[PDB]
Amino acid sequence: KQVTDLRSELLDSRFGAKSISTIAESKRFPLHEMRDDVAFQIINDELYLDGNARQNLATFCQTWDDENVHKLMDLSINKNWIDKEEYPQSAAIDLRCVNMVADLWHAPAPKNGQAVGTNTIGSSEACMLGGMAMKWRWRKRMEAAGKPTDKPNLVCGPVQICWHKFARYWDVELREIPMRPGQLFMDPKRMIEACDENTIGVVPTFGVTYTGNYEFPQPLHDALDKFQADTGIDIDMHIDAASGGFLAPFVAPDIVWDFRLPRVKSISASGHKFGLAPLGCGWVIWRDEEALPQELVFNVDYLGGQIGTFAINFSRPAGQVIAQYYEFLRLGREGYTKVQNASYQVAAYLADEIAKLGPYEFICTGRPDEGIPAVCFKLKDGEDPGYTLYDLSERLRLRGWQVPAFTLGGEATDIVVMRIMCRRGFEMDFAELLLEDYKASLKYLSDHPKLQGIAQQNSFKHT
Amino acid sequence: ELLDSRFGAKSISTIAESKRFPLHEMRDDVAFQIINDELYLDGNARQNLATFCQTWDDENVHKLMDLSINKNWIDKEEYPQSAAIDLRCVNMVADLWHAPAPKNGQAVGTNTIGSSEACMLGGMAMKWRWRKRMEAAGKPTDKPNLVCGPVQICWHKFARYWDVELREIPMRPGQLFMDPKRMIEACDENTIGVVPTFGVTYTGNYEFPQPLHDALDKFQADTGIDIDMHIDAASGGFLAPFVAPDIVWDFRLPRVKSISASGHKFGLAPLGCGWVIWRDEEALPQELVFNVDYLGGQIGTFAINFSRPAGQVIAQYYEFLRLGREGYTKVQNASYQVAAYLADEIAKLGPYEFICTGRPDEGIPAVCFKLKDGEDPGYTLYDLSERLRLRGWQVPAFTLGGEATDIVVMRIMCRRGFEMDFAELLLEDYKASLKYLSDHPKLQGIAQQNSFKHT
Amino acid sequence: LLDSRFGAKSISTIAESKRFPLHEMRDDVAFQIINDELYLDGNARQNLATFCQTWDDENVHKLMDLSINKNWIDKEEYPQSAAIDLRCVNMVADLWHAPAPKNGQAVGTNTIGSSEACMLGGMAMKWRWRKRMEAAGKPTDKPNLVCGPVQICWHKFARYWDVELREIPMRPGQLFMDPKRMIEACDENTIGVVPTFGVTYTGNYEFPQPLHDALDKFQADTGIDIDMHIDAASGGFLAPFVAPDIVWDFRLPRVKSISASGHKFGLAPLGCGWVIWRDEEALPQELVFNVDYLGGQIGTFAINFSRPAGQVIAQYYEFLRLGREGYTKVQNASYQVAAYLADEIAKLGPYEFICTGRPDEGIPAVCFKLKDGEDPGYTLYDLSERLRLRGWQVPAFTLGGEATDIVVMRIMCRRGFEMDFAELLLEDYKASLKYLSDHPKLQGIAQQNSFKHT
Amino acid sequence: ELLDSRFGAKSISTIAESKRFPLHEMRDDVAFQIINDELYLDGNARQNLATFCQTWDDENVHKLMDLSINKNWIDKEEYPQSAAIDLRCVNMVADLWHAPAPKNGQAVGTNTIGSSEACMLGGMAMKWRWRKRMEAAGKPTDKPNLVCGPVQICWHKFARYWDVELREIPMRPGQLFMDPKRMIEACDENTIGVVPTFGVTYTGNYEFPQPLHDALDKFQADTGIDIDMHIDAASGGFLAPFVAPDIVWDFRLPRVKSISASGHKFGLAPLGCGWVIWRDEEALPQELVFNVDYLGGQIGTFAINFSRPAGQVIAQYYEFLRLGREGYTKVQNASYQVAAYLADEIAKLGPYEFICTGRPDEGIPAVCFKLKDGEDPGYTLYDLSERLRLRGWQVPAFTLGGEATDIVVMRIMCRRGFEMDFAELLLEDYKASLKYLSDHPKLQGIAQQNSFKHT
């Protein structure tokens, strides 16, 4: 016997109306119009299922929010970076940024008053551009010397994925010096071993994604000088400064990593990492006009003359440049120094406190002179404290944190590391919470020994 | 000693320093106002009739973009819903373009920042399919070529960056596009693909893939050489499927192995959104896809970029959901009505030859025209373009490439926002500009700089 | 020492967190410091344990924001807030079929939640019982309250007001207050019976009518005349809409008062509850307090005093924008989600259902246990843990009383938790099952009860 | 048919079927504007000088309140940070009030919705401590009394709702408060506690717990009866510790076992915030605390409410953080300067006798006065209160209680936002009021309704 009052169609409890599903028929282009504010609410509501990344300590990307950055981005939604005619002031702001970054990295003073360089969407585009230019300089040099150009290689260390894509996409052989116990990085000796007359260049990673440590270009530079004296082979560098390029110039200026080194022919870095810009910002600088083959530059006509671009992308919003510029303007060397120090302070504290808790061997402990604000550690060989770092990572996820555990590469294919990144916003008070969560996780694992060895999926390690 | 009248305080100049990294902090709200105030020197684009890119404003799109400022498109793990939404978009564009039903339920393809990246990906996929096919037949792979018409700059860049001989069929008077005969004359065993432009940038006319397709079938029958296509649908890819569905241009054509389009042109997305779809898994050589590790397994990506914000995807979604076929159809036809109306009206005002008149069966909502050969009305289209700027319009005048190198066209793009009432206003300023050039004959022949033509 | 957000000396909230701060700090830094730590709260969008409203409506944010300073108690300075509040009382009374008031105004009040509403109802019960014993010459020193598996607010009532709580225990095969066990616990000292019209722990209705029948028979057999307060915290904004023929409210002569939470299925934002009395006779006037103001005087029955009026105002917003028509659609949608989930979940493991999201039986909740003697190689605690890793809070906990060995999972379907979100839960549930099967060493590890109380 | 001029559509009255749950839906935005339009009829309280509750507006507070509309104070599990903030406030309020350092690191206390809930909790705890001891002695426990002065209505409610006999020492001419002598008269073995009011509602004056404390010591000396105190510091609790640190009224007195205060009065929090602190675990009977399971363990609450929003606590913390003792001292001094100034100027205008004059060592920022006995300046304070209403001011006149049922007083409350300039405007309006009453003598004696005195 009935007591209910029902309806015979699927309803939505937000809209008190027939249900609209993003999930059914999400495989065809929708047939009908729907009310705008309804489509908006539907999407806005699903977006709550994303993280906010505040407790994500795997990423390098910016995740703090400044209102002024919000407003600048919001005014710039239609400002086309590529369209100098319609947006001359965005163009001008972009050119300042290029000089500013050039200046920070010690680029030789231009003849014409403009540095050779370009904004990009990220390090990835910036690397291709650097890579391509490498390839082209090398092709010209070999052709001048009547030599075949069909077997180019590129020597590097535990590079970021962008170099694996460049090598693959541009038919360059990647001579990646493998990680091994006792030297996770591209040392002078193994570098020279991998070098020959087909080497388009060497790419040291100034802040290695996997661990946090700098590859130092100066000792590599010396080896390349000795290499030229010994063989006649003249090899240059591109520095992948994704992270370190907005760190060292502020907290460790004495590290000679940049255009101070003559062989350094170009540098890339990620504005949306330690540059402090919002997602979608990268930089690449060349030493001078000679470092950038004019064959790669496209000249387009516009009303005020014609402008030269070297870009993989074309039309795109100018807001990230505009916010980048904001960060440069509001902070300067003075403010960047303070802001990066804070992050280093955080990393260093975490390193010294985590050391107390477990049998750990450290690869990176957030020291300005060795790398980025990152903490990287593994278990001491032959030590079993009653979990793996995988298990501990999982425990930390149930407290809201994402602290990646993953394996190294090459000959260190069975070392499992934990990496913690300290970006803007993850302040001291948030690090104390992490610490408390870490201790509570250890107790839990100690009290629940059956949890050992169960977890074994690598967390996302790439950015 | 210099003061600023805004801040009632010592002057801070963006031009002083501007070449050195600044030394000192400054107050955040001052830096903000400084930059904001300088941004007023940019145009609004509302009156810029050169561009193809979205320049209208919708509060909801502003809201979604702002929500999304930190949403990392690559980071599937942290932003799984952004990821799920992207994947819906890939399926909806595939279906729009009649892609074959996928065995595993997910269409093959990707979001990109623009047509430019989407062209690079399509290009690379062409080059790899041809390479693999030739390697498997024991043949040299060092002389690849690409056959195309009056292509967008991305193809020139692709060719140079990836060492492919660009075989571009030149524009010539009468025939400002890639016709089958000249297409075939350029084709061979080293041809990695043909690239028709479904919406030629310079004119607004569609290159029709079908007759070209038939010519490739005959070419295969005659020589054994089996050449595929990638359609550059930067603009037409979000037009024809709504206002001219019977134009057979997309994955209905077997040889079409991939297609690209700009979500930030007629797809109605904000700047920073392009798409590329492949026919099926075979059309996309796995060697180009990179599999990263994350906690739910691994995802493969084919991208030139890496981290970037997910907002444009999310906005494009909003457009797809709020409009659907029915809404897109009304939205695109309204722009066609604008363009057709301007073609008609402009025609009455001087001695013009039309190349493109906003007809939906021929191209995109553009009006493209030149002065009738010989007829000298008392100005060039440069002059007219300068007059129009003084009244706030950007209506570009430029020369065609190739063998059409004497030809000076004016191109007007009709994009969302540029309604019937604004077209009327342009018409009024057009007339007033003509009146002035008549009253001031000395102006004739003075202006001679091409305006930006590429997007 | 340094802070990266402010590029300045660090100010820590955690350092001197125990003393009153000594010095001023810039207001906007103090704001950003707090705003940043609030990101560590959940948003609850994936929390399926709570009944409370967690969806967002721009109009409600505006009404609350306008109302931050409007004092609910000060009828004189906020007469319009007071008027709106009086309409609410009338409308809730009307929904629950209260006798038309002789004056024009129903006997009822807004509260902060069901907790306060309950205390008020229980106090009135206690007073009514006391008056009836005094007029009969009997002692009043050992009052008891007969109930089933009530919400904590009734244990709080019983303790704070010195009433013996005769809670009928949940048992296997009989989870609720049934008439027989209800009567076995009744006597001349029973101040009343409290059915729970939407049991917190499971989602099921305790049906007042059958209990009402037994209380009639009990008066017939013994002379002892016992009344009811219905705790309709959740059910009070469900049944009148999707199950109007369940006879649970003032249609039953013994139901002397009813309470509900506006901030559960009333759809109001946090900090809104309601209690209504049948008529003036049901509310002892000695409990009502008259305050003097310029327009005369009003009476309130409240444990709180000054507090903001926005919740009431937002509640009224929902009443006006929805009506019966709107509510019926809104609650219907929640039930459809719950029933779907129940059916789908039943296909994925060997489960026994206690609640399946059917509007004739209860609230939009799913509640289940593993079948007796059946071992799929995980416990509901385990599954709940895997679920937390995909972002959901799907609580598992034990039932009380003689059902204390019994572990259940309870899924609450509230506004915003729509069909698409439910499909995603289901994908996540499957994925969790699979992972549990691939990792059988996980079985039995997790053993902490999730928060079950609201 | 009936129309609405706002919507240009058929009229929707909120008054028509206002006694029935509405039948039908209406547009959301119309329902909002309808409600928003009615709310304009509420006062804004800025000219209301009767209330103690926050009426000023701070954007930062609005922003935190709006972020927190859904944060559940009781749900420590889902909102663990709101919880942490709450606990900090408890320790900070405990410290301010000199609570002995916690043996475990956490003070005994809780946020409440207001002083009201806080008084019940305090009242209950006194009841139980008293009960335990009398039950140890096998003594009857069915007649507990509570000894106090001119308490706020919450003590009347506590008394009634918990069957405690309220021994309120009446106000009488020259002694308007609880003194040691009359307090002691009312104490016996049934007294659960004494509640001094540290900021009397009706007058603003402090009841000083120290001389009362001495008397209780003597009482225990003389009779063996050991009586504790609960301080109702609704208003005083956030005034004295900053501007009169030397008044000993808090946990510095051994007998003070708990204290309550309103955050939303001089604590500066928005509406819906109170605090109660206990001296230590012993002052709070465990039987009153409820332990509730959750993931990270379990927490105990002593609360009358359960689910409710965390925003006011968050806002409270905001004020504690941005102000500190330094900032609070300035804020409260400011209010005192205004009260004192008004007392001084007002005494110049008529034959008044002041009960309170905004001295920080005597009471709260309030001015309280009556007409000098047997003096007739040609109006009653009721008459004056009416003239001031016509100028937008609510300045309540009401009769005192007990033996001063005869005295009519005017009381002015000076809270944050009522700055020196507004005090000047009230005075201007006060003088305008005296002038008019003078020019129209027939007004004398007409008005006779007490204004709301309670909060």
Q: Do A72 and B32 touch (CB under 8 A)?
A: yes
Last residue of one domain, picked from the residues B318, B348, B378: B348
Q: Give the contacts of A434 (CB within 8 A, at least 6 positions apart).
A: A57, A350, A401, A403, A420
Let me know: does A164 contact A174? Beta carbons within 8 Å.
yes
Task: With beta carbons under 8 A apart, name residues in chain A contacting B322.
Answer: 33-36, 39-40
Q: Do C360 and A429 touch (CB under 8 A)?
A: no
The residue whose two tokens read 């959750």 is: D294
Q: Do C245 and A6 touch (CB under 8 A)?
A: no
Residues D122 and D35 in one domain: no
Task: With beta carbons under 8 A apart, name residues in chain C contacting A341.
Answer: 2
Residues C249 and C384 in one domain: no
Separation of alpha carbons B183 and B194, rounded Å: 8
Q: Do C334 and A13 touch (CB under 8 A)?
A: yes
Strand ranges inside A63-120, DSSP E: 117-120
Consult the annotation and say whether A315 binds a ligand: no
Q: Cα separations (Å) of B282 from A385, B279, B295, B348, C425?
A: 49, 8, 28, 52, 34
**For chain C, what is the radius of gyration of the CA atoms?**
24
Helical H segments across C262-377, by residue range: 310-346
Separation of alpha carbons D108 and D277, rounded Å: 6
Q: What single letter denotes the amino acid at residue A461?
A: K
The whole-angstrom distance between C412's CA and the closest CA on chain A is: 14
Residues A255 and A379 in one domain: no
Q: Do D72 and C56 touch (CB under 8 A)?
A: no
Give the DSSP letter of residue B271. S
Residue A18, token pair as written in the block: 């027939």
SS3 C144: strand
Last residue of one domain, picked from the residues A20, A45, A62: A62
Closest CB from C26, C303, C322 relative to D25:
C322
Q: Is D341 exposed, middle or buried (0-12, 13-18, 19+ CB in 10 A)?
A: middle
Taking CB atoms and an 8 Å cut-off, how many pairs form between chains A and C?
139
CA dihedral D277, D281, D283, D288 (to 10 degrees): 90
Residues A112 and A175 in one domain: yes
Quote the distance between the C-alpha of residue D307 and its chain's center.
23
The whole-angstrom distance between D12's CA and the closest CA on chain C is: 10
Closest CB from A30, A37, A96 relative to B320:
A30
Quote the distance between the C-alpha of residue D436 and its chain's center.
35
The whole-angstrom distance between C64's CA and the closest CA on chain A is: 19
- Chain D CA closest to residue C392: D78
Indicate the pairing of strand B274-278 with strand B290-294: unpaired
Quote the distance between the C-alpha of residue A444 and its chain's center.
34
Q: Which of C391, A57, A26 is nearest to B80 (CA)?
A: C391
Phi, psi of C272 (to 5 degrees): -140, 120
Q: Do C419 and A19 touch (CB under 8 A)?
A: yes
Closest CB from C47, C57, C87 relative to D78:
C47
Closest CB from D38, D69, D324 relative to C84:
D38
Domain of residue A415, CATH code: 3.90.1150.160
Task: With beta carbons under 8 A apart, name residues in chain C contacting D452.
Answer: 74-76, 291-294
Closest CB from D81, D96, D326 relative to C37:
D81
Separation of alpha carbons A203 and A195, rounded Å: 12
Residue A202, token pair as written in the block: 């060497």
Consult the annotation and say whether D156 binds a ligand: no
The residue whose two tokens read 């009532």 is: C157
| Experimental determination technique | X-ray
Contacting partners of chain C (3+ CB pairs under 8 A): A, D
Domain of residue B41, CATH code: 4.10.280.50
Task: With beta carbons under 8 A apart, name residues in chain B contacting A83.
Answer: 51, 53, 452, 455
Q: Is B378 exposed, middle or buried (0-12, 13-18, 19+ CB in 10 A)?
A: middle
Task: With beta carbons under 8 A apart, name residues in chain C contacting D66.
Answer: 61, 64-65
- Chain A CA closest to residue B385: A303
Inter-axis angle of helices A36-47 and B80-96, nearest 10:
140
Phi, psi of D27 (to 5 degrees): -65, 140
The residue whose two tokens read 């075989």 is: B167
Closest CB from C3, C14, C445 relative to A448:
C445
Residue D231, token pair as written in the block: 């301080």
Strand ranges inside D30-178, DSSP E: 109-112, 145-148, 165-168
Q: Do B71 and A335 touch (CB under 8 A)?
A: no
Residues B310 and B453 in one domain: no
The whole-angstrom distance between A141's CA and the closest CA on chain B is: 17
Separation of alpha carbons C174 and C168, rounded Å: 10
Residues B165 and B215 in one domain: yes
The whole-angstrom distance between C93's CA and the closest CA on chain D is: 8
Domain of residue C207, CATH code: 3.40.640.10
Q: Do C27 and D60 touch (CB under 8 A)?
A: yes
- Chain C CA closest to residue A337: C7
Q: Give the contacts of A146 (CB within 8 A, at least 6 positions apart).
A: none
| Per-position DSSP letters for B194-260, written without gaps between them | EE-BBS-TTT-BBP-HHHHHHHHHHHHHHH-----EEEE-TTGGGTHHHH-TTS--STTSTTEEEEE
The whole-angstrom distance between B110's CA and the closest CA on chain A is: 15
- Chain A CA closest to residue B98: A28
Q: Cα separations (Å) of B21 from A256, A335, B39, B436?
A: 18, 12, 21, 48
Break positions in chain B: residue before each gap, C to N over 2.5 angstroms: none
Q: What single letter denotes the amino acid at residue B365?
A: P
Residue A307, token pair as written in the block: 């402008």
For residue C377, the enclosing domain spans 348-454
* Test the A interface: residue of C1, C2, C4 with most A CBs within 10 Å: C4
Residue A104, token pair as written in the block: 């920070």
Residues B27 and B83 in one domain: no
Report how many domains make up chain A: 3
Closest CB from A11, A394, A425 relative to C329:
A11
Q: Do C65 and D64 touch (CB under 8 A)?
A: no
- Chain A CA closest to residue B298: A460
Q: Which of C448, C374, C371, C357 is nearest to C410 (CA)?
A: C357
Separation of alpha carbons C309 and C79, rounded Å: 11
Q: Give the contacts of C370 (CB within 8 A, at least 6 positions apart).
A: C349, C350, C351, C352, C376, C379, C380, C407
Quote the distance between the C-alpha of residue A359 and its chain's center.
30
Residues A407 and A302 in one domain: no
Residues D83 and D146 in one domain: yes
Indicate the pairing of strand D274-278 with strand D109-112: antiparallel
The whole-angstrom distance between A107's CA and the closest CA on chain C is: 27
Let me know: does D71 contact C41? Beta carbons within 8 Å.
yes
Last residue of one domain, picked from the residues C313, C347, C381: C347
Separation of alpha carbons B409 and B393, rounded Å: 16
Residues D286 and D188 in one domain: yes
Inter-axis angle of helices A319-354 and A67-75, nearest 10:
150
Separation of alpha carbons B290 and A209, rounded Å: 17
The whole-angstrom distance between B34's CA and the closest CA on chain A is: 9
Task: With beta carbons under 8 A apart, name residues in chain A contacting B237.
Answer: none
Residues A432 and A336 in one domain: no
Residue C71, token pair as written in the block: 């004092």
Closest CB from B19, B120, B324 relative to A32:
B324
Indicate the pairing of strand D256-262 with strand D229-232: parallel
The resolution in angstroms reads 2.5
Residues D48 and D82 in one domain: no
